[PDB]
Design an enzyme around this catalytic site. Structure first.
Site, PDB file in Angstrom:
ATOM      1  N   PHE A 209       1.176  -1.153  -0.115  1.00  0.00           N
ATOM      2  CA  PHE A 209       0.028   0.019   0.105  1.00  0.00           C
ATOM      3  C   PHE A 209       0.901   1.482   0.069  1.00  0.00           C
ATOM      4  O   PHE A 209       1.730   1.264   0.715  1.00  0.00           O
ATOM      5  CB  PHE A 209      -0.680   0.006   1.107  1.00  0.00           C
ATOM      6  CG  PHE A 209      -2.179   0.940   1.046  1.00  0.00           C
ATOM      7  CD1 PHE A 209      -3.323   0.662   0.306  1.00  0.00           C
ATOM      8  CD2 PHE A 209      -2.250   2.367   1.543  1.00  0.00           C
ATOM      9  CE1 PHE A 209      -4.387   1.322   0.404  1.00  0.00           C
ATOM     10  CE2 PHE A 209      -3.121   3.219   1.776  1.00  0.00           C
ATOM     11  CZ  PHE A 209      -4.237   2.691   0.595  1.00  0.00           C
ATOM     12  N   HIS A 212       0.488   7.694   2.179  1.00  0.00           N
ATOM     13  CA  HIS A 212      -0.707   8.483   2.485  1.00  0.00           C
ATOM     14  C   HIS A 212      -0.608   8.976   3.874  1.00  0.00           C
ATOM     15  O   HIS A 212       0.321   8.661   4.448  1.00  0.00           O
ATOM     16  CB  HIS A 212      -2.236   7.561   2.584  1.00  0.00           C
ATOM     17  CG  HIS A 212      -2.099   6.579   3.435  1.00  0.00           C
ATOM     18  ND1 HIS A 212      -1.294   5.609   3.287  1.00  0.00           N
ATOM     19  CD2 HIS A 212      -2.600   6.374   4.540  1.00  0.00           C
ATOM     20  CE1 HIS A 212      -1.476   4.473   4.217  1.00  0.00           C
ATOM     21  NE2 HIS A 212      -2.165   5.204   5.113  1.00  0.00           N
ATOM     22  N   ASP A 214      -3.419   9.498   6.972  1.00  0.00           N
ATOM     23  CA  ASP A 214      -4.889   8.958   7.414  1.00  0.00           C
ATOM     24  C   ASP A 214      -6.101  10.120   7.379  1.00  0.00           C
ATOM     25  O   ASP A 214      -5.733  11.076   7.780  1.00  0.00           O
ATOM     26  CB  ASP A 214      -4.750   8.297   8.733  1.00  0.00           C
ATOM     27  CG  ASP A 214      -3.955   7.170   8.750  1.00  0.00           C
ATOM     28  OD1 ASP A 214      -3.604   6.591   7.962  1.00  0.00           O
ATOM     29  OD2 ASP A 214      -3.887   6.616  10.248  1.00  0.00           O
ATOM     30  N   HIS A 268       2.786   7.767   5.885  1.00  0.00           N
ATOM     31  CA  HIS A 268       3.395   6.236   5.882  1.00  0.00           C
ATOM     32  C   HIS A 268       2.697   5.417   4.861  1.00  0.00           C
ATOM     33  O   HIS A 268       1.995   5.936   4.050  1.00  0.00           O
ATOM     34  CB  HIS A 268       2.853   5.795   7.304  1.00  0.00           C
ATOM     35  CG  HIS A 268       1.283   5.906   7.756  1.00  0.00           C
ATOM     36  ND1 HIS A 268       0.791   7.151   7.813  1.00  0.00           N
ATOM     37  CD2 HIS A 268       0.234   5.110   7.582  1.00  0.00           C
ATOM     38  CE1 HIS A 268      -0.526   7.131   7.890  1.00  0.00           C
ATOM     39  NE2 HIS A 268      -0.708   5.832   7.981  1.00  0.00           N
TER      40      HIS A 268
HETATM   41  C1  LIG Z   1      -5.573   5.022   4.182  1.00  0.00           C
HETATM   42  C2  LIG Z   1      -5.632   3.875   5.196  1.00  0.00           C
HETATM   43  S1  LIG Z   1      -5.015   4.179   6.861  1.00  0.00           S
HETATM   44  C3  LIG Z   1      -6.179   2.623   4.880  1.00  0.00           C
HETATM   45  N1  LIG Z   1      -7.620   3.001   5.187  1.00  0.00           N
HETATM   46  C4  LIG Z   1      -8.517   3.001   4.195  1.00  0.00           C
HETATM   47  O1  LIG Z   1      -8.695   2.678   3.189  1.00  0.00           O
HETATM   48  C5  LIG Z   1      -9.884   3.724   4.799  1.00  0.00           C
HETATM   49  C6  LIG Z   1     -11.034   2.817   5.519  1.00  0.00           C
HETATM   50  C7  LIG Z   1     -12.189   3.751   5.751  1.00  0.00           C
HETATM   51  C8  LIG Z   1     -13.199   2.628   6.107  1.00  0.00           C
HETATM   52  N2  LIG Z   1     -13.656   1.989   4.763  1.00  0.00           N
HETATM   53  C9  LIG Z   1     -14.563   3.586   6.533  1.00  0.00           C
HETATM   54  O2  LIG Z   1     -15.244   3.573   5.729  1.00  0.00           O
HETATM   55  O3  LIG Z   1     -13.997   4.109   7.578  1.00  0.00           O
HETATM   56  C10 LIG Z   1      -6.035   1.372   5.666  1.00  0.00           C
HETATM   57  O4  LIG Z   1      -6.430   1.038   6.673  1.00  0.00           O
HETATM   58  O5  LIG Z   1      -4.898   0.680   5.314  1.00  0.00           O
HETATM   59  C11 LIG Z   1      -4.001   0.075   6.632  1.00  0.00           C
HETATM   60  C12 LIG Z   1      -3.215  -0.898   6.331  1.00  0.00           C
HETATM   61  O6  LIG Z   1      -3.226  -1.055   5.054  1.00  0.00           O
HETATM   62  O7  LIG Z   1      -2.936  -1.799   7.013  1.00  0.00           O
HETATM   63  C13 LIG Z   1      -3.490   1.389   6.614  1.00  0.00           C
HETATM   64  C14 LIG Z   1      -3.190   1.971   5.252  1.00  0.00           C
HETATM   65  C15 LIG Z   1      -1.913   1.312   7.479  1.00  0.00           C
HETATM   66  O8  LIG Z   1      -1.502   2.853   7.320  1.00  0.00           O
HETATM   67 FE   LIG Z   2      -2.840   4.745   7.389  1.00  0.00          FE
END
Ligand SMILES: C=C(S)[C@H](NC(=O)CCC[C@H](N)C(=O)O)C(=O)O[C@@H](C(=O)O)[C@H](C)CO
Ligand SMILES: [Fe+2]
Length: 329
Positions: A209, A212, A214, A268
């Site tokens: 990933f 980005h 958060d 991150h």
């Molecule tokens: C940008 C991030 S932090 C990603 N988050 C999302 O895609 C948002 C989810 C929102 C959820 N569907 C909602 O509707 O609230 C995520 O959770 O990925 C985590 C990971 O890959 O472990 C992360 C990338 C580790 O940093």
């Molecule tokens: Fe994140």
């Protein structure tokens, strides 16, 4: 060499008590972390984290294709137009490794006022069949309130760290309207591992990933013990070490905005590792109409020229942007 990030371990247990000075000594550590790399581990936190990775595995391991289509978000199943956030995010064998399950405030039911008004970002959770997954829904709902409890404590810490009264953030974080989400993410072991599921960074690092900030006020994360996260610094990316007993904490872009970037949303990214693992974030969001008046801790008068931002609008914009930048998860 890639260097290693300084991620202090902070005993947060005083934030649950009435020793005000002890709480200030925690606030101070949260301050220093927030001004350095941005991350710390919350330790002595009171949550049974052994009882959470256990349950999460079982679920991801024993859920069938049939059940995943039945639970799928709109991006995977056009029949489910109301499921934008909550439900199942399928893997695509040969192409996409990662899969997950997202759920929201359990108070969001058919007769919750925001559901009846059809307000954006609010949805009624979908759950698997109780006989194929016994105790799963009870577990997941209780976990939401355990992590809710911890986050409230953490917010009291961030408040005191910024020179505010301890309820400055927490007064907007309420069981009845919080937009907070839990995501239960499985990262599988695969052999051969699919090339399309691995991305190459500008610096050559192989990623699951991309970089980005958060979309959150703060992020409260449990992960199993496989090192994967990296935080960006001026000298480049540093490794965040794993700790499967604590919670990894960081600010999101709502905090950056409110504090005039005093507490940055750290950038991150997730390294690729071919190992079976779990990543369970809790995204600490406020209510749809919550507004924090921005301020500037660097200025003697504390004043900022930034416009107050309503949380639901910030959240809608943010979730669309993540998908356009880093892809449909
Ligand atoms: C940008 C991030 S932090 C990603 N988050 C999302 O895609 C948002 C989810 C929102 C959820 N569907 C909602 O509707 O609230 C995520 O959770 O990925 C985590 C990971 O890959 O472990 C992360 C990338 C580790 O940093
Ligand atoms: Fe994140």
């Amino acid at each position: 060499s890639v260097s290693k990030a300084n991620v202090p371990k902070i005993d947060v247990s005083p934030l649950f008590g009435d020793d005000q000075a002890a709480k200030m000594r925690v606030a101070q550590q949260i301050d220093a972390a927030s001004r350095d790399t941005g991350f710390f581990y919350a330790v002595n936190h009171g949550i049974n984290v052994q009882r959470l990775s256990q349950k999460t595995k079982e679920f991801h391991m024993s859920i069938t294709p049939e059940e995943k289509w039945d639970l799928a978000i709109r991006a995977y199943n056009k029949e489910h137009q109301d499921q934008v956030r909550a439900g199942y995010y399928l893997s695509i064998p040969g192409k996409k490794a990662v899969e997950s399950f997202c759920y929201l405030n359990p108070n969001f039911t058919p007769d919750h006022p925001r559901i009846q008004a059809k307000t954006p970002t609010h949805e009624v959770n979908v759950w698997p069949d109780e006989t194929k997954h016994p105790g799963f829904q009870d577990f997941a709902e209780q976990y939401y309130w355990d992590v809710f409890g911890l986050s409230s404590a953490l917010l009291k810490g961030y408040a005191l760290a910024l020179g505010k009264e301890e309820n400055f953030f927490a007064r907007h974080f309420k069981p009845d309207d919080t937009l907070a989400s839990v995501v239960l993410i499985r990262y599988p072991y695969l052999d051969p591992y699919p090339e399309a599921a691995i991305k190459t960074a500008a610096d050559g690092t192989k990623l699951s990933f991309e970089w980005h900030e958060d979309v959150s006020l703060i992020t409260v994360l449990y992960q199993s013990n496989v090192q994967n996260l990296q935080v960006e610094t001026a000298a480049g990316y540093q490794d965040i070490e794993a700790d499967d007993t604590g919670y990894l904490i960081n600010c999101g872009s709502y905090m950056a905005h409110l504090t005039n970037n005093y507490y940055k949303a750290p950038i991150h990214r997730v390294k690729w590792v071919n190992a079976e693992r779990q990543s369970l974030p809790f995204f600490v969001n406020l209510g749809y109409d919550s507004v924090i008046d921005p301020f500037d801790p660097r200025e003697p008068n504390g004043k900022s020229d930034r416009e107050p931002l309503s949380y639901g609008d910030y959240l809608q914009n943010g979730l669309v942007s993540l998908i356009n930048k880093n892809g449909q998860t």
